[PDB]
From Swiss-Prot, chain A:
Origin superkingdom: Eukaryota
Subcellular location: Vacuole membrane
Section covered of the full-length record: 893 to 961 of 1029
Miscellaneous field: Present with 1200 molecules/cell in log phase SD medium.
Function: Required for vacuolar biogenesis and for trafficking of hydrolase precursors to the vacuole. Mediates transport at the vacuolar membrane where it may be responsible for tethering transport vesicles on the target membranes. It is required for gluconeogenic growth of yeast. Acts as a component of the HOPS complex that acts during the docking stage of vacuole fusion. HOPS is an effector for the vacuolar Rab GTPase YPT7 and is required for vacuolar SNARE complex assembly. It remains bound to SNARE complexes after vacuole fusion.
The species this protein was found in: Saccharomyces cerevisiae (strain ATCC 204508 / S288c) (Baker's yeast)
Name of protein: E3 ubiquitin-protein ligase PEP5
Subunit organization: Component of the homotypic vacuole fusion and vacuole protein sorting (HOPS) complex, which is composed of a core of the 4 class C Vps proteins PEP5/VPS11, PEP3/VPS18, VPS16, VPS33 associated to VAM6/VPS39 and VPS41/VAM2. HOPS associates with phosphoinositides and the PX domain of VAM7. Component of the class C core vacuole/endosome tethering (CORVET) complex, which is composed of a core of the 4 class C Vps proteins PEP5/VPS11, PEP3/VPS18, VPS16, VPS33 associated to VPS3/PEP6 and VPS8. Interacts with PEP3, PEP7 and VAM7.
Family according to the record: Belongs to the VPS11 family.
From Swiss-Prot, chain B:
Compartments it resides in: Cytoplasm
Origin superkingdom: Eukaryota
Section covered of the full-length record: 779 to 1011 of 1011
Organism annotation: Saccharomyces cerevisiae (strain ATCC 204508 / S288c)
Entry protein name: Vacuolar protein sorting-associated protein 3
Function summary: Required for sorting and processing of soluble vacuolar proteins, integrity of vacuolar morphology, efficient segregation of vacuolar material into the bud during the cell cycle, acidification of the vacuolar lumen, and assembly of the vacuolar H(+)-ATPase.
Misc remark: Present with 2270 molecules/cell in log phase SD medium.
Protein family: Belongs to the VPS3 family.
Gene from which this protein is expressed: VPS3
From Swiss-Prot, chain C:
Assembly notes: Component of the HOPS complex which is composed of PEP5, VPS16, PEP3, VPS33, VPS39 and VPS41. HOPS associates with phosphoinositides and the PX domain of VAM7. Interacts with PEP5, PEP7 and VAM7.
Additional remarks: Present with 2020 molecules/cell in log phase SD medium.
Name of this protein: Vacuolar membrane protein PEP3
Family: Belongs to the VPS18 family.
Gene behind the chain: PEP3
Part of the intact protein present: 1 to 368 of 918
Protein task: Required for vacuolar biogenesis and for trafficking of hydrolase precursors to the vacuole. Mediates transport at the vacuolar membrane where it may be responsible for tethering transport vesicles on the target membranes. Acts as a component of the HOPS complex that acts during the docking stage of vacuole fusion. HOPS is an effector for the vacuolar Rab GTPase YPT7 and is required for vacuolar SNARE complex assembly. It remains bound to SNARE complexes after vacuole fusion.
Lineage: Eukaryota, Fungi, Dikarya, Ascomycota, Saccharomycotina
Amino acid sequence: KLIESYDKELKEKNKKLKNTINSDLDIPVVFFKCGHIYHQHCLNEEEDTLE
Amino acid sequence: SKFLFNYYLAKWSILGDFIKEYKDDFAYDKTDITNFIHIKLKHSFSKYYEKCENLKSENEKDDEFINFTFDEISKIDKEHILTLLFFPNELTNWSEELLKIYLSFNDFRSVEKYIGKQNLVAVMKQYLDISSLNYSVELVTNLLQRNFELLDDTDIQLKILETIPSVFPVQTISELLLKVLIKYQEKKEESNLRKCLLKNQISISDELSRNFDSQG
Amino acid sequence: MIKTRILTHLKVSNDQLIIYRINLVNHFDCIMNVHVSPMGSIRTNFGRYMLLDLSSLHWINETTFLMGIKKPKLYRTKLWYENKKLSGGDGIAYWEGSLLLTDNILYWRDEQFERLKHHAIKKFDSYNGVTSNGIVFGDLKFLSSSKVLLNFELPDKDHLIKIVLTAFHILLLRKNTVTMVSQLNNDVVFHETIPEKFLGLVRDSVETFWCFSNINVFEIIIENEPNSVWNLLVRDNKFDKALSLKGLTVREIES
Protein backbone atom coordinates (compact mmCIF):
# COMPACT_ATOMS: atom_id res chain seq x y z
CA LYS A 1 0.00 0.00 0.00
CA LEU A 2 2.81 2.41 0.86
CA ILE A 3 4.62 1.77 -2.43
CA GLU A 4 1.40 2.11 -4.45
CA SER A 5 0.62 5.43 -2.77
CA TYR A 6 4.20 6.68 -3.07
CA ASP A 7 4.53 5.96 -6.80
CA LYS A 8 1.34 7.86 -7.66
CA GLU A 9 2.21 10.70 -5.29
CA LEU A 10 5.70 11.08 -6.78
CA LYS A 11 4.34 11.03 -10.34
CA GLU A 12 1.69 13.65 -9.52
CA LYS A 13 4.19 15.85 -7.68
CA ASN A 14 6.69 15.67 -10.55
CA LYS A 15 3.98 16.55 -13.09
CA LYS A 16 2.75 19.47 -10.97
CA LEU A 17 6.28 20.78 -10.45
CA LYS A 18 7.05 20.53 -14.17
CA ASN A 19 3.83 22.37 -15.03
CA THR A 20 4.58 25.10 -12.48
CA ILE A 21 8.13 25.53 -13.78
CA ASN A 22 6.93 25.69 -17.39
CA SER A 23 4.27 28.25 -16.42
CA ASP A 24 6.92 30.79 -15.40
CA LEU A 25 10.54 41.42 -12.56
CA ASP A 26 10.72 38.28 -14.71
CA ILE A 27 14.48 37.57 -15.03
CA PRO A 28 15.67 34.10 -13.92
CA VAL A 29 16.24 34.33 -10.17
CA VAL A 30 15.47 32.51 -6.92
CA PHE A 31 13.01 34.45 -4.77
CA PHE A 32 13.48 34.55 -1.01
CA LYS A 33 11.25 31.93 0.60
CA CYS A 34 10.14 34.26 3.42
CA GLY A 35 8.43 37.09 1.54
CA HIS A 36 10.88 38.67 -0.89
CA ILE A 37 11.79 38.51 -4.57
CA TYR A 38 14.35 40.26 -6.77
CA HIS A 39 16.15 39.85 -10.07
CA GLN A 40 19.48 38.02 -9.90
CA HIS A 41 20.82 39.94 -12.92
CA CYS A 42 19.92 43.19 -11.10
CA LEU A 43 22.98 42.61 -8.86
CA ASN A 44 20.83 41.00 -6.14
CA GLU A 45 22.64 37.68 -6.54
CA GLU A 46 25.97 37.31 -4.71
CA GLU A 47 25.69 40.34 -2.43
CA ASP A 48 28.56 38.96 -0.27
CA THR A 49 28.37 40.37 3.32
CA LEU A 50 28.85 36.78 4.57
CA GLU A 51 25.30 36.11 3.28
CA SER B 1 43.29 -39.55 -37.02
CA LYS B 2 39.82 -39.55 -35.47
CA PHE B 3 39.50 -43.26 -36.33
CA LEU B 4 41.95 -44.11 -33.54
CA PHE B 5 39.95 -41.89 -31.19
CA ASN B 6 36.79 -43.70 -32.30
CA TYR B 7 38.58 -46.99 -31.63
CA TYR B 8 39.71 -45.57 -28.28
CA LEU B 9 36.13 -44.49 -27.60
CA ALA B 10 34.93 -47.97 -28.59
CA LYS B 11 37.58 -49.54 -26.34
CA TRP B 12 28.64 -49.78 -14.63
CA SER B 13 28.85 -52.34 -11.82
CA ILE B 14 30.83 -50.79 -8.95
CA LEU B 15 29.48 -47.35 -9.90
CA GLY B 16 26.22 -48.11 -8.11
CA ASP B 17 28.05 -49.26 -4.98
CA PHE B 18 30.19 -46.11 -5.01
CA ILE B 19 27.09 -43.94 -5.46
CA LYS B 20 25.37 -45.68 -2.55
CA GLU B 21 28.46 -45.24 -0.36
CA TYR B 22 28.59 -41.54 -1.22
CA LYS B 23 24.86 -41.19 -0.51
CA ASP B 24 25.39 -42.82 2.89
CA ASP B 25 27.20 -39.70 4.09
CA PHE B 26 24.94 -36.74 4.89
CA ALA B 27 27.42 -33.92 5.49
CA TYR B 28 26.38 -30.40 4.50
CA ASP B 29 29.85 -29.36 3.30
CA LYS B 30 31.46 -32.68 2.36
CA THR B 31 33.50 -33.30 -0.79
CA ASP B 32 31.84 -32.18 -4.01
CA ILE B 33 30.23 -34.62 -6.42
CA THR B 34 33.09 -34.11 -8.87
CA ASN B 35 35.50 -34.29 -5.92
CA PHE B 36 33.88 -37.52 -4.71
CA ILE B 37 34.07 -39.00 -8.21
CA HIS B 38 37.75 -38.05 -8.44
CA ILE B 39 38.44 -39.60 -5.03
CA LYS B 40 36.67 -42.81 -6.08
CA LEU B 41 38.66 -42.89 -9.33
CA LYS B 42 41.89 -42.43 -7.37
CA HIS B 43 40.84 -45.32 -5.13
CA SER B 44 40.18 -47.32 -8.32
CA PHE B 45 39.65 -47.94 -16.38
CA SER B 46 40.45 -44.22 -16.48
CA LYS B 47 43.86 -45.00 -18.01
CA TYR B 48 42.13 -45.62 -21.34
CA TYR B 49 40.16 -42.43 -20.69
CA GLU B 50 43.46 -40.75 -19.84
CA LYS B 51 44.77 -41.93 -23.21
CA CYS B 52 41.62 -40.43 -24.70
CA GLU B 53 42.17 -37.41 -22.45
CA ASN B 54 45.62 -37.00 -24.02
CA LEU B 55 43.85 -36.82 -27.38
CA LYS B 56 41.17 -34.67 -25.74
CA SER B 57 43.86 -32.34 -24.41
CA GLU B 58 45.26 -32.11 -27.94
CA ASN B 59 41.65 -31.49 -29.07
CA GLU B 60 41.33 -28.12 -27.30
CA LYS B 61 40.16 -26.60 -30.61
CA ASP B 62 38.59 -29.59 -32.42
CA ASP B 63 34.96 -28.62 -31.89
CA GLU B 64 33.70 -31.23 -34.36
CA PHE B 65 35.80 -33.92 -32.67
CA ILE B 66 34.53 -32.72 -29.28
CA ASN B 67 30.93 -33.08 -30.46
CA PHE B 68 31.66 -36.53 -31.90
CA THR B 69 33.27 -37.61 -28.62
CA PHE B 70 30.27 -36.31 -26.66
CA ASP B 71 27.90 -38.23 -28.93
CA GLU B 72 29.99 -41.39 -28.53
CA ILE B 73 30.03 -40.98 -24.74
CA SER B 74 26.24 -40.58 -24.80
CA LYS B 75 26.03 -43.78 -26.86
CA ILE B 76 28.56 -45.47 -24.54
CA ASP B 77 26.82 -44.27 -21.39
CA LYS B 78 27.30 -46.41 -18.26
CA GLU B 79 24.41 -45.96 -15.80
CA HIS B 80 24.30 -42.35 -17.08
CA ILE B 81 27.26 -41.73 -14.73
CA LEU B 82 30.53 -42.48 -16.55
CA THR B 83 29.98 -39.48 -18.84
CA LEU B 84 30.90 -37.28 -15.87
CA LEU B 85 34.35 -38.86 -16.07
CA PHE B 86 34.58 -37.92 -19.75
CA PHE B 87 33.07 -34.46 -19.05
CA PRO B 88 34.32 -33.27 -15.65
CA ASN B 89 33.62 -29.66 -16.69
CA GLU B 90 32.01 -30.13 -20.12
CA LEU B 91 28.32 -30.22 -19.18
CA THR B 92 27.48 -28.01 -22.19
CA ASN B 93 29.29 -30.23 -24.72
CA TRP B 94 26.11 -32.31 -25.22
CA SER B 95 21.96 -27.00 -16.87
CA GLU B 96 18.27 -28.00 -16.39
CA GLU B 97 19.36 -31.66 -16.44
CA LEU B 98 22.25 -32.26 -14.01
CA LEU B 99 19.86 -32.35 -11.03
CA LYS B 100 18.73 -35.79 -12.23
CA ILE B 101 22.19 -37.17 -11.32
CA TYR B 102 24.04 -34.42 -9.43
CA LEU B 103 21.13 -33.81 -7.06
CA SER B 104 20.14 -37.50 -6.98
CA PHE B 105 22.18 -38.70 -3.99
CA ASN B 106 23.76 -35.50 -2.60
CA ASP B 107 25.63 -32.51 -4.05
CA PHE B 108 25.69 -29.23 -2.13
CA ARG B 109 28.03 -27.61 -4.67
CA SER B 110 25.85 -28.69 -7.60
CA VAL B 111 22.76 -27.50 -5.72
CA GLU B 112 24.29 -24.03 -5.40
CA LYS B 113 25.48 -24.10 -9.03
CA TYR B 114 21.99 -25.00 -10.31
CA ILE B 115 20.04 -22.96 -7.73
CA GLY B 116 17.46 -20.41 -8.81
CA LYS B 117 14.41 -18.40 -7.87
CA GLN B 118 12.12 -21.30 -8.82
CA ASN B 119 12.47 -25.03 -8.07
CA LEU B 120 13.58 -24.20 -4.52
CA VAL B 121 10.82 -25.60 -2.28
CA ALA B 122 11.03 -28.94 -4.11
CA VAL B 123 14.76 -29.17 -3.38
CA MET B 124 14.14 -28.49 0.31
CA LYS B 125 11.38 -31.11 0.42
CA GLN B 126 13.63 -33.68 -1.27
CA TYR B 127 16.50 -32.93 1.12
CA LEU B 128 14.09 -33.20 4.07
CA ASP B 129 13.83 -36.96 3.41
CA ILE B 130 17.12 -37.55 5.26
CA SER B 131 15.04 -38.51 8.34
CA SER B 132 17.97 -37.78 10.66
CA LEU B 133 17.29 -36.79 14.27
CA ASN B 134 19.31 -33.56 14.02
CA TYR B 135 21.70 -33.94 11.06
CA SER B 136 18.81 -33.29 8.67
CA VAL B 137 17.92 -30.10 10.56
CA GLU B 138 21.56 -28.99 10.51
CA LEU B 139 21.80 -29.65 6.76
CA VAL B 140 18.57 -27.72 6.13
CA THR B 141 19.85 -24.77 8.17
CA ASN B 142 23.17 -24.82 6.30
CA LEU B 143 21.40 -24.91 2.93
CA LEU B 144 19.14 -22.02 3.94
CA GLN B 145 22.04 -19.93 5.23
CA ARG B 146 24.28 -20.61 2.22
CA ASN B 147 21.86 -19.02 -0.28
CA PHE B 148 19.82 -16.80 2.04
CA GLU B 149 19.76 -14.05 -0.60
CA LEU B 150 18.10 -16.35 -3.15
CA LEU B 151 14.71 -16.09 -1.42
CA ASP B 152 13.38 -12.60 -2.18
CA ASP B 153 9.65 -13.16 -2.84
CA THR B 154 6.95 -12.79 -0.20
CA ASP B 155 4.98 -15.77 -1.52
CA ILE B 156 8.16 -17.85 -1.79
CA GLN B 157 9.17 -16.86 1.75
CA LEU B 158 5.74 -17.80 3.11
CA LYS B 159 5.84 -21.14 1.30
CA ILE B 160 9.33 -21.87 2.64
CA LEU B 161 8.31 -20.96 6.20
CA GLU B 162 5.17 -23.11 5.93
CA THR B 163 7.11 -26.32 5.24
CA ILE B 164 9.47 -25.94 8.23
CA PRO B 165 9.95 -29.05 10.41
CA SER B 166 7.52 -29.31 13.32
CA VAL B 167 9.77 -31.33 15.67
CA PHE B 168 12.91 -29.19 15.63
CA PRO B 169 14.36 -27.08 18.46
CA VAL B 170 13.68 -23.36 18.18
CA GLN B 171 17.37 -22.59 18.76
CA THR B 172 18.43 -23.96 15.36
CA ILE B 173 15.96 -21.78 13.42
CA SER B 174 16.20 -18.81 15.80
CA GLU B 175 18.97 -17.14 13.78
CA LEU B 176 17.08 -17.55 10.50
CA LEU B 177 13.83 -16.26 12.02
CA LEU B 178 15.61 -13.25 13.54
CA LYS B 179 17.32 -12.48 10.23
CA VAL B 180 14.03 -12.70 8.32
CA LEU B 181 12.25 -10.48 10.85
CA ILE B 182 15.09 -7.93 10.78
CA LYS B 183 15.05 -7.87 6.98
CA TYR B 184 11.28 -7.34 6.93
CA GLN B 185 11.52 -4.56 9.52
CA GLU B 186 14.34 -2.88 7.59
CA LYS B 187 12.33 -3.05 4.35
CA LYS B 188 9.29 -1.55 6.09
CA GLU B 189 11.42 1.22 7.61
CA GLU B 190 13.00 1.99 4.23
CA SER B 191 9.57 2.17 2.59
CA ASN B 192 8.31 4.47 5.35
CA LEU B 193 11.37 6.71 4.99
CA ARG B 194 10.89 6.89 1.22
CA LYS B 195 7.22 7.78 1.70
CA CYS B 196 8.16 10.48 4.21
CA LEU B 197 10.74 11.92 1.80
CA LEU B 198 8.17 11.94 -1.00
CA LYS B 199 5.69 13.70 1.30
CA ASN B 200 8.35 16.28 2.18
CA GLN B 201 9.04 16.88 -1.52
CA ILE B 202 5.31 17.26 -2.17
CA SER B 203 5.10 19.75 0.71
CA ILE B 204 8.01 21.70 -0.78
CA SER B 205 6.22 21.79 -4.14
CA ASP B 206 3.02 22.96 -2.43
CA GLU B 207 4.97 25.69 -0.63
CA LEU B 208 6.46 26.80 -3.96
CA SER B 209 2.96 26.91 -5.47
CA ARG B 210 1.70 28.94 -2.51
CA ASN B 211 4.62 31.36 -2.90
CA PHE B 212 3.81 31.71 -6.61
CA ASP B 213 0.20 32.45 -5.64
CA SER B 214 1.53 35.10 -3.27
CA GLN B 215 3.65 36.34 -6.19
CA GLY B 216 0.67 37.98 -7.88
CA MET C 1 27.57 43.22 -20.31
CA ILE C 2 31.21 44.16 -20.95
CA LYS C 3 32.36 47.78 -20.83
CA THR C 4 34.74 49.07 -23.50
CA ARG C 5 36.53 52.42 -23.70
CA ILE C 6 39.53 53.29 -25.88
CA LEU C 7 56.91 56.97 -35.22
CA THR C 8 59.61 54.40 -35.96
CA HIS C 9 58.57 51.70 -33.48
CA LEU C 10 57.01 51.29 -30.05
CA LYS C 11 56.97 48.58 -27.40
CA VAL C 12 55.49 47.82 -23.99
CA SER C 13 56.98 45.25 -21.60
CA ASN C 14 55.98 46.00 -17.99
CA ASP C 15 54.29 49.31 -17.10
CA GLN C 16 56.64 51.19 -19.42
CA LEU C 17 56.57 52.97 -22.77
CA ILE C 18 59.17 53.81 -25.40
CA ILE C 19 63.43 60.24 -27.76
CA TYR C 20 61.10 60.83 -24.82
CA ARG C 21 60.50 58.28 -22.07
CA ILE C 22 57.70 57.28 -19.70
CA ASN C 23 58.14 56.11 -16.11
CA LEU C 24 54.58 55.30 -14.94
CA VAL C 25 59.52 63.73 -19.54
CA ASN C 26 63.16 62.71 -19.84
CA HIS C 27 64.61 62.55 -23.36
CA PHE C 28 66.99 59.76 -24.36
CA ASP C 29 69.83 59.98 -26.86
CA CYS C 30 68.71 59.86 -30.49
CA ILE C 31 66.62 53.88 -35.75
CA MET C 32 64.86 51.34 -37.97
CA ASN C 33 63.23 48.68 -35.76
CA VAL C 34 62.79 48.12 -32.03
CA HIS C 35 62.37 45.06 -29.83
CA VAL C 36 61.86 45.02 -26.05
CA SER C 37 62.29 41.94 -23.85
CA PRO C 38 59.77 41.05 -21.11
CA MET C 39 61.58 43.27 -18.59
CA GLY C 40 60.00 46.71 -18.44
CA SER C 41 63.29 48.57 -18.01
CA ILE C 42 66.72 47.20 -30.63
CA ARG C 43 68.67 47.65 -33.88
CA THR C 44 69.16 51.20 -35.13
CA ASN C 45 69.50 52.34 -38.76
CA PHE C 46 73.12 51.10 -38.78
CA GLY C 47 72.12 47.47 -39.32
CA ARG C 48 73.38 46.36 -35.89
CA TYR C 49 72.77 46.87 -32.17
CA MET C 50 75.70 48.18 -30.12
CA LEU C 51 76.00 46.87 -26.57
CA LEU C 52 70.57 41.08 -40.26
CA ASP C 53 67.82 40.66 -42.86
CA LEU C 54 65.67 38.66 -40.44
CA SER C 55 61.95 39.43 -40.83
CA SER C 56 61.04 37.87 -37.49
CA LEU C 57 61.00 38.96 -33.84
CA HIS C 58 59.64 37.11 -30.81
CA TRP C 59 60.93 37.23 -27.23
CA ILE C 60 61.23 33.57 -26.24
CA ASN C 61 61.78 34.49 -22.58
CA GLU C 62 62.68 37.47 -20.39
CA THR C 63 66.02 37.66 -22.24
CA THR C 64 65.87 35.26 -25.21
CA PHE C 65 64.52 36.06 -28.67
CA LEU C 66 63.89 34.38 -32.01
CA MET C 67 64.40 35.65 -35.55
CA GLY C 68 64.85 34.31 -39.06
CA ILE C 69 65.45 35.57 -42.62
CA LYS C 70 62.60 35.24 -45.18
CA LYS C 71 65.12 33.85 -47.74
CA PRO C 72 64.92 30.10 -42.73
CA LYS C 73 67.91 29.81 -40.31
CA LEU C 74 66.12 30.64 -37.04
CA TYR C 75 68.57 31.49 -34.27
CA ARG C 76 67.21 31.48 -30.72
CA THR C 77 72.42 31.36 -30.86
CA LYS C 78 70.07 28.39 -31.26
CA LEU C 79 69.15 27.46 -34.83
CA TRP C 80 65.96 25.52 -35.55
CA TYR C 81 65.73 24.75 -39.30
CA GLU C 82 66.32 26.20 -42.76
CA ASN C 83 64.31 25.39 -45.88
CA LYS C 84 62.81 27.28 -48.84
CA LYS C 85 62.31 31.06 -48.82
CA LEU C 86 59.57 33.71 -49.13
CA SER C 87 59.05 36.93 -51.18
CA GLY C 88 58.42 39.33 -48.25
CA GLY C 89 59.17 38.10 -44.71
CA ASP C 90 55.46 34.33 -40.81
CA GLY C 91 54.11 32.01 -38.10
CA ILE C 92 57.00 31.80 -35.63
CA ALA C 93 54.99 30.72 -32.59
CA TYR C 94 57.02 28.69 -30.08
CA TRP C 95 56.14 28.42 -26.39
CA GLU C 96 55.21 25.96 -23.63
CA GLY C 97 57.61 23.35 -24.99
CA SER C 98 56.01 23.46 -28.44
CA LEU C 99 56.37 25.27 -31.76
CA LEU C 100 53.99 26.37 -34.50
CA LEU C 101 54.07 28.06 -37.89
CA THR C 102 51.72 29.54 -40.48
CA ASP C 103 52.90 28.57 -47.30
CA ASN C 104 53.50 25.36 -45.35
CA ILE C 105 52.76 24.26 -41.78
CA LEU C 106 54.75 21.56 -39.98
CA TYR C 107 53.61 19.95 -36.73
CA TRP C 108 56.05 20.62 -33.87
CA ARG C 109 54.99 18.96 -30.62
CA ASP C 110 58.29 19.89 -28.95
CA GLU C 111 47.50 25.74 -45.40
CA GLN C 112 47.72 28.78 -47.70
CA PHE C 113 47.34 32.48 -46.98
CA GLU C 114 47.25 35.69 -49.00
CA ARG C 115 50.47 37.67 -49.38
CA LEU C 116 52.30 40.02 -51.74
CA LYS C 117 55.68 41.60 -52.42
CA HIS C 118 55.02 43.67 -49.28
CA HIS C 119 52.73 41.24 -47.48
CA ALA C 120 51.15 41.46 -44.02
CA ILE C 121 53.42 42.43 -41.13
CA LYS C 122 51.82 41.11 -37.94
CA LYS C 123 49.14 38.64 -39.03
CA PHE C 124 50.31 36.05 -36.47
CA ASP C 125 50.51 37.66 -33.02
CA SER C 126 49.07 35.95 -29.94
CA TYR C 127 49.82 36.63 -26.28
CA ASN C 128 49.46 34.66 -23.03
CA GLY C 129 50.90 31.63 -24.88
CA VAL C 130 45.33 34.40 -41.57
CA THR C 131 44.45 35.17 -45.24
CA SER C 132 42.27 37.39 -47.40
CA ASN C 133 39.64 34.61 -47.41
CA GLY C 134 39.70 34.14 -43.63
CA ILE C 135 41.74 33.67 -40.48
CA VAL C 136 42.74 30.61 -38.45
CA PHE C 137 42.71 30.56 -34.65
CA GLY C 138 44.78 27.94 -32.85
CA ASP C 139 46.26 27.44 -29.38
CA LEU C 140 48.64 24.61 -28.47
CA LYS C 141 47.12 24.42 -24.97
CA PHE C 142 45.99 20.60 -32.55
CA LEU C 143 45.74 20.86 -36.34
CA SER C 144 42.54 18.79 -36.38
CA SER C 145 41.00 20.91 -33.61
CA SER C 146 41.98 24.14 -35.41
CA LYS C 147 38.97 26.16 -36.54
CA VAL C 148 38.58 28.90 -39.17
CA LEU C 149 36.55 32.09 -39.55
CA LEU C 150 35.66 33.34 -43.02
CA ASN C 151 36.76 36.87 -43.86
CA PHE C 152 33.48 37.38 -45.74
CA GLU C 153 31.70 36.96 -42.39
CA LEU C 154 33.64 39.91 -40.96
CA PRO C 155 31.82 43.26 -40.82
CA ASP C 156 32.38 45.80 -43.60
CA LYS C 157 43.74 49.24 -49.15
CA ASP C 158 40.17 48.27 -48.20
CA HIS C 159 40.60 48.23 -44.41
CA LEU C 160 44.26 47.21 -44.39
CA ILE C 161 44.63 44.67 -41.58
CA LYS C 162 47.39 45.02 -38.98
CA ILE C 163 47.21 40.76 -34.21
CA VAL C 164 45.64 41.28 -30.78
CA LEU C 165 44.63 37.87 -29.38
CA THR C 166 43.29 38.34 -25.86
CA ALA C 167 42.14 35.53 -23.58
CA PHE C 168 38.45 36.38 -24.05
CA HIS C 169 38.23 37.95 -27.52
CA ILE C 170 40.45 38.53 -30.56
CA LEU C 171 41.04 42.00 -32.00
CA LEU C 172 42.30 43.08 -35.43
CA LEU C 173 43.10 46.46 -36.98
CA ARG C 174 41.69 46.56 -40.55
CA LYS C 175 42.98 50.12 -40.88
CA ASN C 176 40.05 52.03 -39.37
CA THR C 177 37.83 48.93 -39.00
CA VAL C 178 39.28 47.52 -35.77
CA THR C 179 36.84 45.03 -34.28
CA MET C 180 36.68 42.55 -31.40
CA VAL C 181 35.34 39.02 -31.92
CA SER C 182 34.82 36.20 -29.42
CA GLN C 183 37.62 33.64 -29.68
CA LEU C 184 35.19 30.71 -29.33
CA ASN C 185 31.63 31.92 -29.95
CA ASN C 186 32.61 33.07 -33.48
CA ASP C 187 30.70 36.32 -32.92
CA VAL C 188 31.97 39.88 -33.28
CA VAL C 189 31.80 41.55 -29.86
CA PHE C 190 32.07 45.12 -31.20
CA HIS C 191 34.03 47.33 -33.59
CA GLU C 192 36.03 50.55 -33.33
CA THR C 193 37.04 53.36 -35.69
CA ILE C 194 40.66 54.56 -35.66
CA PRO C 195 41.18 57.94 -37.45
CA GLU C 196 46.33 59.72 -40.43
CA LYS C 197 48.75 56.80 -40.71
CA PHE C 198 48.78 54.30 -37.84
CA LEU C 199 52.17 53.20 -36.51
CA GLY C 200 50.81 50.15 -34.70
CA LEU C 201 48.96 48.79 -31.69
CA VAL C 202 50.40 46.70 -28.85
CA ARG C 203 49.00 44.95 -25.79
CA ASP C 204 50.51 45.07 -22.31
CA SER C 205 52.30 41.83 -21.46
CA VAL C 206 51.76 42.11 -17.69
CA GLU C 207 46.70 43.40 -19.34
CA THR C 208 46.02 46.49 -21.45
CA PHE C 209 46.33 47.65 -25.06
CA TRP C 210 48.12 50.74 -26.40
CA CYS C 211 48.11 51.99 -30.00
CA PHE C 212 51.10 54.02 -31.17
CA SER C 213 50.62 56.52 -34.00
CA ASN C 214 52.70 59.32 -35.50
CA ILE C 215 49.83 61.83 -35.30
CA ASN C 216 48.82 60.81 -31.77
CA VAL C 217 49.21 57.67 -29.66
CA PHE C 218 46.11 55.89 -28.38
CA GLU C 219 45.10 52.99 -26.15
CA ILE C 220 42.40 50.33 -25.88
CA ILE C 221 40.80 49.31 -22.57
CA ILE C 222 38.00 46.84 -21.82
CA GLU C 223 36.10 45.92 -18.67
CA ASN C 224 33.86 43.14 -17.33
CA GLU C 225 35.31 40.62 -19.80
CA PRO C 226 35.28 37.65 -17.36
CA ASN C 227 31.70 38.37 -16.25
CA SER C 228 30.24 38.17 -19.76
CA VAL C 229 31.99 34.89 -20.62
CA TRP C 230 30.86 33.35 -17.32
CA ASN C 231 27.45 32.32 -18.66
CA LEU C 232 28.91 31.22 -22.01
CA LEU C 233 31.53 29.09 -20.26
CA VAL C 234 28.83 27.69 -17.97
CA ARG C 235 26.74 26.85 -21.04
CA ASP C 236 29.57 24.70 -22.40
CA ASN C 237 31.10 21.26 -21.94
CA LYS C 238 34.35 22.65 -20.52
CA PHE C 239 34.05 23.50 -16.83
CA ASP C 240 37.58 23.17 -15.44
CA LYS C 241 38.70 26.31 -17.26
CA ALA C 242 35.47 28.03 -16.23
CA LEU C 243 36.08 26.97 -12.62
CA SER C 244 39.52 28.60 -12.81
CA LEU C 245 37.90 31.93 -13.71
CA LYS C 246 38.19 34.56 -10.98
CA GLY C 247 36.60 37.91 -10.26
CA LEU C 248 33.00 36.72 -10.67
CA THR C 249 29.88 36.46 -8.52
CA VAL C 250 30.29 34.35 -5.39
CA ARG C 251 26.81 32.84 -5.70
CA GLU C 252 27.32 32.20 -9.42
CA ILE C 253 30.58 30.39 -8.67
CA GLU C 254 28.70 28.31 -6.10
CA SER C 255 25.90 27.88 -8.65
